[PDB]
Ligand binder design. Structure first.
Ligand code: MG
Ligand code: MG
Ligand code: NA
Ligand code: NA
Ligand code: NA
Ligand code: NA
Lengths: 409, 204
């Protein structure tokens, strides 16, 4: 517990950019795109106001548009007098992917028409399309093969406080070891994480901070309308914060909270507000109505585990169950606890052989061990119960491909 | 119940089946079988023939059947086993786990075939486990997969009975003959003997 992420003070003008969303849509062969930027303002609404959105590739300005406020009519009462949508055409855009993280810079200027900049906001933009078609998850029209890992935010001396050095150290090692994707198990990450994945190039599953694993049954709260408000905020606020990062390719509704009607309501909310990314969620059997991707945890390659209600079928068998057509990407597989990873090659042979098996996220990146000091003051790696904590789950916190100090296992 | 149409020896295999001038001749082989056998309850699926590639005539006859007799699915393996002329993926000799990616008409592992993008049909092999001589090795692998995958609904082994013919030696004693034993040439030698049983019905 604690104030474990940054604290900052931000000055905004009274008339200000209160939100902005960037979208990139393409023609059939990705040789042409339209960047659309919806900008909202708060404060003093007057006809002299304008928004200019400009797009840059390095020091070159590739496109630019300026418009006054006032969006299209949307209903019988008119439109949003406090919003404007700019549409910029971009020819032959450089596309973003984890393989080549090409980025542009969009600068959003709020200004008077006669030239006074009130304030400017901005973001890195990655031109890419994410869509599931005919049972395949495609990025820029090609089927991805997810070489992923789940990564908690953990430092053996600082706990849950993340620092830039550590995050960079982690991304370098991930890429050096042929990973191309990371799942934010199980909550939104420190904001710099997304910037780093956008820039170095990693596909990201951004996940709402909702996990109620200890309830019995697991959906007791998620199926209860009284908890819809608290859950809604964890999903909606994450989307509002991270929707313009190109690294985020899939939204997740949280983890191990069964399948409740509140997940269905929230799945639909995100599909309405952000049609650019698929939404996934493993709870309730990994292939419920609240997921666009079959995303089991620890389903085996050939072996079925037919538990009642929530069986974990062989992944090859799961894809062809009667009526199923979605792609399957394990949200967790190959639990790397201790001397583990036995059978890892079996998963990769399957992924390469079956088109709709598009990979998965290993559990997990780094052991959650903490540093303790002995009588002589020498450091040593501690696990559950080592701090007097009880009940505890002992070494179950160490499931990493790397030790807490980032030395590889 | 399968129409008497097989043009395996043409090059390419659908040379006649894609030619409209052969539509009439083919149509009769399909329509007159349906007219004759459509009241038999044992017939559960109609087949458009065998190893004749995939031609427009097949599509035409597939729809004829579906229109006159909706009570039975229609299958046909030619042209890759999953064409528009078949309601069942019905490959011949596709293996359980191993793909055989031949050009144009690949034979995918049956487990993978079910799940190719967009595919939803059931899979029943029209022929599998070629029982020629000392054979049937790996037969259990097919059955373990059929029981594990709902959409893998079985198959028809190739085949029941060896096509050997009896000949008699100098002393008048009978012996089992195969291709070339009658002076026939060219011939395909023992490839006519692929059965689970000998010609006289003694089992292999
Ligand atoms: Mg305990
Ligand atoms: Mg010969
Ligand atoms: Na694949
Ligand atoms: Na754990
Ligand atoms: Na089956
Ligand atoms: Na034969």
């Amino acid at each position: 517990s604690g104030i474990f992420r940054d604290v900052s003070l931000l000055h905004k003008p009274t008339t200000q950019i209160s939100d902005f969303h960037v979208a990139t849509r393409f023609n059939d062969d990705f040789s042409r795109a339209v960047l659309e930027a919806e900008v909202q303002m708060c404060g003093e609404l007057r006809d002299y106001l304008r928004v200019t959105v400009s797009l840059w590739q390095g020091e070159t300005q590739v496109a630019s548009g300026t418009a006054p406020f006032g969006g299209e009519i949307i209903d019988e009462r008119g439109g949003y007098a406090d919003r404007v949508t700019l549409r910029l055409n971009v020819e032959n855009p450089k596309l973003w992917s984890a393989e080549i993280p090409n980025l542009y810079r969009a600068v959003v200027e709020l200004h008077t028409a006669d030239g006074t900049l009130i304030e400017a906001e901005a973001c890195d933009v990655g031109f890419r399309e994410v869509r599931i078609e005919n049972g395949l998850l495609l990025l820029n029209g090609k089927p991805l093969l997810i070489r992923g890992v789940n990564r908690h935010e953990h430092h053996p001396l600082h706990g849950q406080v993340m620092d830039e050095q550590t995050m960079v150290q982690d991304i370098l090692l991930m890429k050096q070891n042929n990973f191309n994707a990371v799942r934010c198990s199980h909550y939104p990450n420190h904001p710099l994480w997304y910037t780093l994945c956008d820039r170095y190039g990693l596909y990201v599953v951004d996940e709402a901070n909702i996990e109620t694993h200890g309830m019995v049954p697991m959906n007791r709260l998620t199926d209860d309308p009284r908890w819809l408000p608290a859950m809604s905020e964890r999903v909606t606020r994450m989307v509002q914060r991270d929707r313009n990062h190109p690294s985020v390719i899939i939204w997740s509704l949280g983890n191990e909270s069964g399948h409740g009607a509140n997940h269905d309501a929230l799945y639909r909310w995100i599909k309405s507000v952000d049609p650019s990314r698929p939404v996934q969620y493993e709870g309730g059997g990994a292939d419920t109505t609240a997921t666009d991707i079959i995303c089991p945890m620890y389903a085996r390659v050939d072996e079925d585990q037919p538990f009642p209600a929530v069986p974990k079928w062989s992944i090859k068998k799961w894809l062809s169950l009667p009526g199923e057509t979605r792609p399957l990407i394990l949200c967790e597989y190959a639990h790397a606890m201790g001397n583990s990873l036995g059978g890892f090659a079996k998963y990769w042979q399957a992924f390469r052989q079956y088109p709709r098996l598009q990979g998965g996220f290993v559990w997990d990146w780094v052991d959650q061990s903490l540093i303790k000091y002995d009588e002589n003051g020498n450091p040593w790696s501690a696990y559950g119960g080592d701090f007097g904590d009880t009940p505890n789950d002992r070494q179950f916190c160490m499931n990493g491909l790397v030790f807490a100090d980032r030395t590889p296992h």
